[PDB]
Amino acid sequence: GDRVADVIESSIGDSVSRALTHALPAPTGQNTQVSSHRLDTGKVPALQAAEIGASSNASDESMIETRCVLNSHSTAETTLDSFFSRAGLVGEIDLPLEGTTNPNGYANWDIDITGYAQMRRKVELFTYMRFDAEFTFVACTPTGEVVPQLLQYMFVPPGAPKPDSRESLAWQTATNPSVFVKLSDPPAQVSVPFMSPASAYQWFYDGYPTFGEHKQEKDLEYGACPNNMMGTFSVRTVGTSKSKYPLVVRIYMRMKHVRAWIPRPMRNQNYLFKANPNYAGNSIKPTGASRTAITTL
Amino acid sequence: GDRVADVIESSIGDSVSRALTHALPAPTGQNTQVSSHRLDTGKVPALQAAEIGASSNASDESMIETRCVLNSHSTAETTLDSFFSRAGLVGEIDLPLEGTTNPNGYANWDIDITGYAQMRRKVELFTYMRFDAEFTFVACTPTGEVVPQLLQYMFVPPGAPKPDSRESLAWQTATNPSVFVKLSDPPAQVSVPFMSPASAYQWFYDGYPTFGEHKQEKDLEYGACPNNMMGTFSVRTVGTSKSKYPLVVRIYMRMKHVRAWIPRPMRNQNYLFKANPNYAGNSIKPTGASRTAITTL
Amino acid sequence: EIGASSNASDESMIETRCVLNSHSTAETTLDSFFSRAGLVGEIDLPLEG
Amino acid sequence: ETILEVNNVPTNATSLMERLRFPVSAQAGKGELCAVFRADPGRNGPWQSTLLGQLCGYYTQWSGSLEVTFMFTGSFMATGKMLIAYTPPGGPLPKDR
Amino acid sequence: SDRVAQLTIGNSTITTQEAANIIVGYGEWPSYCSDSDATAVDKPTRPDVSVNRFYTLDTKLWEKSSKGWYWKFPDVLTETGVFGQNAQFHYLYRSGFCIHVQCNASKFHQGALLVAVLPEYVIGTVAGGTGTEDTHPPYKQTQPGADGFELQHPYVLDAGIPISQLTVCPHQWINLRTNNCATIIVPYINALPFDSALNHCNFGLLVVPISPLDYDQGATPVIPITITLAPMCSEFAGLRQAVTQ
Amino acid sequence: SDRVAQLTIGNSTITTQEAANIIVGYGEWPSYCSDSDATAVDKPTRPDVSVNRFYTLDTKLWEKSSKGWYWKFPDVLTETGVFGQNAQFHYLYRSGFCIHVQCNASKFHQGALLVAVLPEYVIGTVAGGTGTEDTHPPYKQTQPGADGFELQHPYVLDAGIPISQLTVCPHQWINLRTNNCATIIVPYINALPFDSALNHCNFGLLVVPISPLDYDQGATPVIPITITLAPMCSEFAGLRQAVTQ
Amino acid sequence: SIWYQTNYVVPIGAPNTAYIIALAAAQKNFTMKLCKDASDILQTGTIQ
């Protein structure tokens, strides 16, 4: 039981996060109301104090004489799903006949969508994201030709054995999900759930994955968050003998059922590597165009 | 407010000290009830388990066949006040004419009753004590003669100026309490309240009064508790000129309105110093008498 | 020795807090575990063999 | 519950059974160490001998509390007191008791 | 009445006679973790007043040429007072923060500082200048501690992102002609209910001059910027021996 | 059903199959300080589980010639875990304790240990042997820390008092043929509501063999005595920088 | 980690060394998600 007063009256343990703001429905752009001349003292909408950290509350109505405008312009196309639920390229996998990369008829791709700028820049506008996704796989030769070849895509989650050859035992795929399809068939397509151990994926992690001394030789692990490492995507031509055709597999992703938290500045320097925000120090460019003088267009 | 369960159900802050025992009135020794022979299995009052830490619960009734005895023997004389409220010697102060101690006609005695064994051993049976006290002052020459001399006793609390001579300005006693009396008058007597900053005086303090390094040269402060230092008792012959008589002042204390906590073993080695329990290491004696054999009286 | 597994729980071994566990048990049903197509046979029909 | 091979060191055929049990014996009272192992259930090591560890291998993620029950097979006349500790992440192997 | 303020928490109190209101990150006050969001089963410890108090950790000098600085949370406090001890003895930690940045001058000095909070502030390197070298920042740069660290290329926040859009994060400005402090309250921000105070920095505090400090010869030239902060609703779990990293 | 027991507090649990009940010092359980007994005005901190847990601090070897040992509270814990940190950072401290002394042997070993708690256990010196020298015990003897200290003259408890009357204090015995542990619960004992954990030792724990350890050649000769203890209802106040003494 | 709290004690006539068997399992709050193939494939060549 509790008897001393400070304990009875403490707020220790309050799990209800008080919120200062709340969402209102806004299916259309706000309307404009009629306004007339105002010649007052005390009232001063135009003057602000940006230091406070809030944006101006001044509106058209109070800065100029306005008319009434019934605005029925929709706000639908700027929802998170509207913005992200559009399939974009996030991965390429080459299966050449004579090459230096994957000449053995199979390939392992670490699921990581940060290899392409268009898609990357869009998701990095937010820190945390949670979503399901639709993945489409487009295959063909390097000329775009369609050949009668059978492929096998297999999702190898962390801890499952990664195939080490075209005839690897792991292709038995008794538990992992695999897709068998022909380059002649339409692109393969499947739905993927939100698989992270966390409540959301995060495009930025200002930390280290393990404890201990973080000496020079381990600094490559700064920013590495296993909660984002969903596994490997393996592909192989189906046969004990080498394929007769050189192949390419393009991977497209379409997010759906999206939720995002913590907006952030948008990348303004070219990307260099998948794992980090490194930028070319000798080529730091302005965010946008420039001009000769501040008094000339 | 509180919302998470562990916080709502915690006992953090309970100020009610649960007590396993309670006092019952006991104005007389317990009576004895009639008892007869008992020849049972399962029942065994005589067997105990001293390891538990409790004293035997076995009674006369269950160990021998008893008769009824109505015991009207009082328990009154063993109350704390009965035991302590008896005046005993706790201080002596000499005011000689020609001497090496206090030949200037005045003396300062640090109020400390641990200079005499009889009184000391009694109070040290408890760790904490709280009480008021009656102090009696008996004065006379070293032969026990009564001379026509006027004295001044003054209580100098910590921080008040201690007289440094028989004509010291501090004897103006404008705020401190002073008693002027003649050796011819009966012994002076006054009542003293419980003056400690603590809830009780303590005959033992296993600690240091200050912080810092407790090096060899400061070990004399181990066990010193200012909460027990009530001040100085100063005495002087009243006059600018030396007294014509050698004097002795015996101080008797009679506690009253006594409360005591935490009983402890009773001193079994002679005392050596006021401030501590030091004992003569080469004279550690048995607590009591001894004999030649365990099989002979 | 009895042959049964321990009945001891977190609650009785350490001071615990309340945790509302909504983690599903669906993926460990027999159908969830087995109803996934796997290879069980290969048959070769060579020309010269 | 299944047997946890804490003593997963012997590897020759004739000594495999020794992996099923680890020893304790009279010491010198310096709070000496008896044994150690990672609690990680789906990781290479002792847990691999258990049915839990094996079934655990067919799933990518897990969540839950674990329990290890130790049975003393010494003689009835043997007594003793052991301290079994669990060190959450971040704590290196304890140097002392 | 919006310019004056008093922030009292624990055994510490802060005053300011030239404030600019208070910002509450993403519009929500710090709170303890609910029983439905929690996952770890051990009963947490909530020290309260001994750790939820104001700590003044560092003072930087604002100069006409200063580029800007940043600090990582909870890194800045991991070795200070009782909070630090709890962060070291426990695997799990969670809390909110009240940040109060101080900088006063005279009615004749000028300049403006942008004070902002950026969650998951990952640092990038200049990749060897040419961008052909995949270098990585060192521990003393990702987790600088109480002394913080100076930005090398403020325009891109040392992470390839435009500082001109940093205002999309909870922030305030210290415009010398207006206010002498910035106060931002931050709730716990993470994808997990609790996390390690040592391996993970939830957000970074940036203090960057956007309008340069200026004044005439003769006026006090030493213009300090002091950083004071207080944890709010601190919770700890997963107890064991102390660990510094 | 009085022989078996489980003591769970914090993230620690103790078991014993040969107990002898539990003693509750002076018949009262530990409790927090009421608002009427308190005097200091600052809000206290009550860490709870992070400090009210079992700490195993030391192991002594019981030998046929052992004289006995003692430990001072809270001295033994001032440098251990989170409790220690709080005792160091705060001027004021108060708490209770659950003491569990462990010592097992065989049905062929014998001996009895008296385990007792003595409040305000002031130590005395032998005064130079002759008693003419007013010497004083050194800091390492008054506050021995976790290693404790061995009694020089157990008969008089190194303080001129008869150990034969120590049973007037909360105690238990470890008689090898009966039990292998002693459990004593102690409430906060002082004349003040709070006090310094560093300058004042509220009580001392004494473990003294009254009936010597014995056994025949061939039986395990190493018979340890382990000391485990847990603070109860710990409260702290008067916060500032950490201090060790 | 497992440590000796006191010591293993035995009288004359009984073994100075004994063994401990460890049994492990999961609590009732234990669950698993995202099915995958086990890390092992108990077969070298074709099974005939």
Ligand SMILES: CCO/N=C/c1ccc(OCC[C@@H](C)CCN2CCN(c3ccnc(C(N)=O)c3)C2=O)cc1
């Ligand atoms: C027959 C079988 O067909 N199987 C198909 C199939 C396809 C796709 C699958 O997985 C989709 C998981 C995707 C959406 C997660 C992408 N994420 C989230 C966070 N993150 C990330 C964050 C910070 N940094 C980095 C970084 N690389 O530096 C990376 C990502 O890349 C699984 C199976």
Ligand SMILES: CCO/N=C/c1ccc(OCC[C@@H](C)CCN2CCN(c3ccnc(C(N)=O)c3)C2=O)cc1
């Ligand atoms: C005209 C004016 O007439 N004025 C008379 C008058 C007489 C007596 C007065 O004060 C009586 C206070 C007495 C009762 C307190 C005695 N105590 C309590 C604790 N303690 C103590 C504890 C541990 N150790 C020591 C030690 N010495 O090592 C010592 C004590 O000695 C004041 C005034």
